[PDB]
Amino acid sequence: LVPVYIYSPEYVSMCDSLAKIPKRASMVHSLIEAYALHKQMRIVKPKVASMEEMATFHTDAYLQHLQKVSDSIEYGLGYACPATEGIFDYAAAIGGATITAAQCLIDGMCKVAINWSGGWHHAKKDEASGFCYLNDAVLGILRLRRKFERILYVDLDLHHGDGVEDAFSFTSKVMTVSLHKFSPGFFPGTGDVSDVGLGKGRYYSVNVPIQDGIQDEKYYQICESVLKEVYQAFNPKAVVLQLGADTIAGDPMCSFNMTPVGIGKCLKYILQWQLATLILGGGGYNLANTARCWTYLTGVILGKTLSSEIPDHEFFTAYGPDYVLEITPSCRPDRNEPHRIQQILNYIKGNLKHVV
Numbered sequence: 001l002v003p004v005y006i007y008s009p010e011y012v013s014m015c016d017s018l019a020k021i022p023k024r025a026s027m028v029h030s031l032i033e034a035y036a037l038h039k040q041m042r043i044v045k046p047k048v049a050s051m052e053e054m055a056t057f058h059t060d061a062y063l064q065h066l067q068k069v070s071d072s073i074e075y076g077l078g079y080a081c082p083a084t085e086g087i088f089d090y091a092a093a094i095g096g097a098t099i100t101a102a103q104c105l106i107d108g109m110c111k112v113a114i115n116w117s118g119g120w121h122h123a124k125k126d127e128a129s130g131f132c133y134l135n136d137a138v139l140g141i142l143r144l145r146r147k148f149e150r151i152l153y154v155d156l157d158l159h160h161g162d163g164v165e166d167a168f169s170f171t172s173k174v175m176t177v178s179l180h181k182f183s184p185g186f187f188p189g190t191g192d193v194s195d196v197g198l199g200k201g202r203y204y205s206v207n208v209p210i211q212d213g214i215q216d217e218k219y220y221q222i223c224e225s226v227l228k229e230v231y232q233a234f235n236p237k238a239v240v241l242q243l244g245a246d247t248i249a250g251d252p253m254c255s256f257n258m259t260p261v262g263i264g265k266c267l268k269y270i271l272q273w274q275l276a277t278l279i280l281g282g283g284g285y286n287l288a289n290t291a292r293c294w295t296y297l298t299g300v301i302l303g304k305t306l307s308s309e310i311p312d313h314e315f316f317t318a319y320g321p322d323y324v325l326e327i328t329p330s331c332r333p334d335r336n337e338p339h340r341i342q343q344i345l346n347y348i349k350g351n352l353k354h355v356v
């Protein structure tokens, strides 16, 4: 009944090697440890993923190439996803870390597993995208299929989880839900409310397009509402939740305007179903704030309520100028006309009827 935590000094150091977010893993783990939250969790070392396990989703041609590299401009290995030395070993560690976490759920060893360094949702079966060379969220879902018959994927990252959606857009065994910013020119440019899946998977893909400024209350209402209709019509067996913190105020991305307390309520709501739950990270470019967010969340997963003062630890200096765990919203307008949010929620409502 104690949450599993995918930790390991070799793993955390492996993660800190990704140039896009230098040292974010240490910072997150460290802050979580400074609150001594690992004290109330089942620390589990992650096993590196095998070439046969990655092959359950990615193609050999792609996997062979990722390896060779560790005409790249043919697999999406360029600006966003560089042909860096070691990415292969890097991806394997993150894929295996999520697979290792999934196995625990299908062994009753716990009702919740955590891997903050995971959540790379943009990767396609044979192509790297938006900083992702391998899709651990899919590997994790394909692993949960072994025991669970209906998996629900909720993506709370600032960006549309296109990679995971495409992977399952033709099936009704796995349903994806994504609340993300949608606007022309904003990566990856997919996921409008009209997007609902294809073929035998029609309606088993839910997309909530949102605009800048949205704050905690407006966001929870929207999320709580949709997660409601979905638990109704789908009646999931297990849940995979991606929690990219690039939605939180202060992120250089400067779009949404959330705080960890908003996402927290959404997390509570999902945990209330007591279904098996695999927690993942994702985007998050204000390093200190990402740690503030995932630590607080690790805290709602445990029922505990953390101190407002940031405990002294290796990265204590990065929490200035106030040195607290709370995040204050920025002073800028919510651009979500309340009438459009309703149109969308109805359009959703209607679409869920079609489910069994």
Ligand SMILES: CN(C)c1ccc(C(=O)NCCCCCCC(=O)NO)cc1
Pocket (backbone or CB within 6 Å): 079, 080, 130, 131, 157, 158, 159, 160, 187, 244, 246, 282, 283, 284
């Ligand atoms: C120098 N600098 C600040 C940047 C340079 C390039 C990009 C970019 O290509 N972006 C497109 C892909 C963005 C990936 C977002 C990953 C994510 O959060 N997914 O949810 C961005 C910033």
Ligand SMILES: [K+]
Pocket (backbone or CB within 6 Å): 168, 169, 170, 171, 172, 173, 174, 175, 176, 197, 201, 204, 205
């Ligand atoms: K689907």
Ligand SMILES: [K+]
Pocket (backbone or CB within 6 Å): 155, 156, 157, 158, 159, 160, 161, 178, 179, 180
């Ligand atoms: K999202």
Ligand SMILES: [Zn+2]
Pocket (backbone or CB within 6 Å): 157, 158, 159, 244, 246, 282, 283, 284
């Ligand atoms: Zn993101």
